[PDB]
Structure formats: C-alpha cells, structure tokens
Design a protein around this ligand. Structure first.
Ligand SMILES: [Ca+2]
Ligand SMILES: [Ca+2]
Ligand code: NI
Ligand code: NI
Lengths: 235, 236
C-alpha cells in the first residue's frame, strides 16, 4: 500500500489524541473509550529536554499501544536520527521532526523515507512530518515539501511556552495550502499545541482544510467520555 | 521518624521494582499485585538521551503512581539539578544522581538536602543517592559519603557496550563497605542493571549485605505474579 492511499484514509479521522495526557494508570480504559468512539489516532510528544525544556518520554512511550492504532509520533529532540530509529522500531506510523532542528533534518528524512511499518493489518511506508513553531517561516519548507507527508503547525513555541495568536496559525495553514497547490490531497496539514475547544472551533470555522487537530491536557480535564461528547457535538 | 529511621524501615524491603518495565496498559494491575505482595518500592529510570543514549521518561513518569509507594528515582541525565527539581515536585522519595555528572553533582545534592517529601502520611527528607557505572572509581565517592544515603552500583554502563563481570560488582560493594566503616548501617547499598534471578542469587549469595536489587525487564518477562512467587521462594 502506498503513502497516498494511507493519507487519504487518515483524513477520515479528525483528532490525533495525545494519549499520555491521560492518567497513566488508566491508559487501557482511555484507549478503549477512544476506539469505542471511532478514534484510533494517538499522538505522542517525544521530547528530551534539549529542543525545549519539555522532557516527556522516549520511544518506550508508544510501545505498548495496539498496532490497530495509528501512532503519530512527534519528536522534539536533539538527536533526531537516533530517536527516529527508536520510535520506528517501536512501531511509529508517522514520525514528525522539528524543521528548526536543521542539523540532522535532511539526514533523518532520508532514513525515514526507506522505512515501513505495519498499521492495522497492512504494511505501509512510515509517514514523514515537519513541524514548525509559530515564528518559523513557511518559506523554510520549500526544500522538503515534496518529500514530507505531514505539515504540522504548532500554536505555541515550546522553547518559551509562548502561545501565539490563532489568526496567525490559520494564516500559516493558508500559506502552506497555497504552496501545496494541486498536491494538497497528498498531505496532512495538522495543528498541535495546547488545543482547547475554543481554538478547535476557530480553526474549523476557518474555511481552510485542517486534517487533524492534536489533543492535549484539555481532553483529559474532566472525564474523557464527557469531553468526547462535546467534541463530537461542538466540532 | 527521622531519615535514619526511614532508612531502617526501607531495609525491610529487598526489591526496588522497575515498574515502567511493565506493559504500560497494565500499570494499575501491576502496582496492585506488588502491593498485595508487600512490595511498594518503585524504581524509575529518568534518562534524557544525553548522559547516554538511554532515553526513557521524564518526571511525568512518576506522577501517577500512588503516594503510598516509595518512589526511587534514578537520574541518568545531563541537567541533574533541573530534573531533580521536577521529580521532587512529582513526589520522588529518593533521587539518585550519576557520580559521572561531575558538573552539577555537588550542587544538586546541596539542593536535595533541603527537600522534604511525603511517604505514607509523614514528612521525611528526600533521600539522596549516588550511582556509579562500573569503571568509575569507588574512591570518587569519598567526598560525598556523609551527604548521601544510597550508593547504587550499576552492573552495566549505558554509555558502553561492555560486558562487565558480575564478580567486579560484588568487589565494588566491598570497596564501598570498606570506606563507609561503621557508617554502613546508615546507608543503602543497591545494585541496578539487567537484573535476573541468577544474578540476584549471586549477589544475595551473601557475606556482603546488599539492601535493594533493582528489577527490570526480567520481572515482567512472563506473569508478574509468577515471577514474584519465584523471587520470594528463592531469595526471601
Ligand atoms: Ca483527568
Ligand atoms: Ca510481560
Ligand atoms: Ni505534539
Ligand atoms: Ni535504574
């Protein structure tokens, strides 16, 4: 199966859930609740305290989640190649790098391009993502746009904790869409960073196609089931 | 209870369980099983991919475990001071530093020495550990022996692919013991790294008191309940 076929299938899903935002003693039930609600995309922030102060989990974090879940693995690390190998080895289906981490960006996307993993009950190439912090110019994507599958836009800069204006983020979505042209159908444009129902509604009211929004602590502030009912009702 | 009395009580346990070696979707069942078995010491390897290539989990890893468990938090990181603050905030009861992290070791134990935490329903000082990779000279511990509570010896170096004979680790326990003298009673001397039943039997094969063995993947290779039955019948 090709990347393109997979990408079109994924667009059926609207939420990449940051599952480790849950209580780690309730992970099985949380994932069960997600599956019961036709959600199977799980986001992981793999962060080493080197890109930002953010020091979260390594590859081990993604390991025990079922292979019938799509593992959207977001790296914010110093050693992107090494960490990419580790997450691919633990079943990552998408590996997203930080564009700002330029020292091994190209090398890592080169290695990723040759990897395959299994999703659901089939073998696919691993999807490759590029994430940009809010001030990183969309213009810096140009050398890689053809090669990447996912463009992820952060709402905030983890390197300072600063949350950026939602209108800026929507503008950036437009700038990305423009550059993709007729190849827009070949990519996911996703938004990540301290997602709230208010941001979610603003981005989806925005008349420009966003594929996935990534959930954070807000989904798990209160019962997941409750919050899912709102997501499903409101957005 | 003082720090010393806590240390004596802690010595009643023989195993510090590497809980995140479990299947993460089963963490609650696994913690329940340990508690049912009179085991409540949980070991966490907080590793940032910088001290070595080992990159496990940050402070969030300890957060959701019950405060009635004793959290034995082993740092293998570049910025020890910063991580120590983060793990203490998430309830660390013991913070073990790498002696090889020379740049902030003393500073971090200085900070740790001012900290207090909750174990059971009582406030204690945070216990302080020093961990050595196998090739690090025991003599380098000398300046800190009175400031630390726990000496942890690794059976392996995560920065290496070297296979270190187990006999050398027991030799190192003797080197620590000899330096401590009558202070030994005040400390835990613990062994960590790829622990197996065989290795446990060897280390426990006496003469030289070892307080905790830290468990890893072996404890969760097969059913936890089964492996605990095995551990208790062999060693306990
Ligand atoms: Ca919650
Ligand atoms: Ca197992
Ligand atoms: Ni993310
Ligand atoms: Ni350890």
């Amino acid at each position: 199966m090709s990347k393109l076929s997979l990408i079109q299938q994924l667009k059926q899903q609207k939420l990449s859930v940051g599952i480790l935002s849950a209580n780690w003693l309730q992970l099985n039930e949380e994932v069960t609740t997600l599956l019961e609600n036709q959600i199977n995309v799980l986001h992981f922030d793999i962060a080493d305290g080197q890109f930002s102060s953010l020091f979260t989990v390594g590859a081990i974090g993604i390991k025990y989640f079922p292979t019938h879940c799509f593992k959207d693995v977001h790296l914010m690390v110093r050693n992107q190649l090494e960490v990419a190998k580790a997450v691919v080895a633990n079943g990552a289906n998408l590996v997203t790098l930080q564009l700002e981490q330029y020292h091994d960006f190209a090398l890592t996307i080169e290695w990723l391009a040759k990897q395959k993993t299994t999703y659901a009950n089939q073998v696919y190439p691993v999807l490759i993502g590029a994430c940009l912090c809010p001030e990183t110019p969309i213009s810096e994507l140009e050398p890689y746009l053809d090669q990447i599958d996912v463009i992820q836009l952060l709402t905030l800069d983890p390197r300072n904790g600063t949350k950026y204006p939602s209108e800026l983020i929507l503008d950036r979505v437009i700038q990305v869409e423009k550059r993709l042209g007729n190849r827009r159908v070949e990519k996911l444009i996703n938004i990540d960073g301290s997602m709230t129902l208010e941001l979610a509604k603003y981005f989806k009211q925005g008349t420009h196609q966003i594929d996935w929004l990534v959930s954070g602590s807000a989904l798990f502030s209160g019962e997941l089931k409750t919050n899912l009912k709102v997501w499903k009702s409101s957005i």
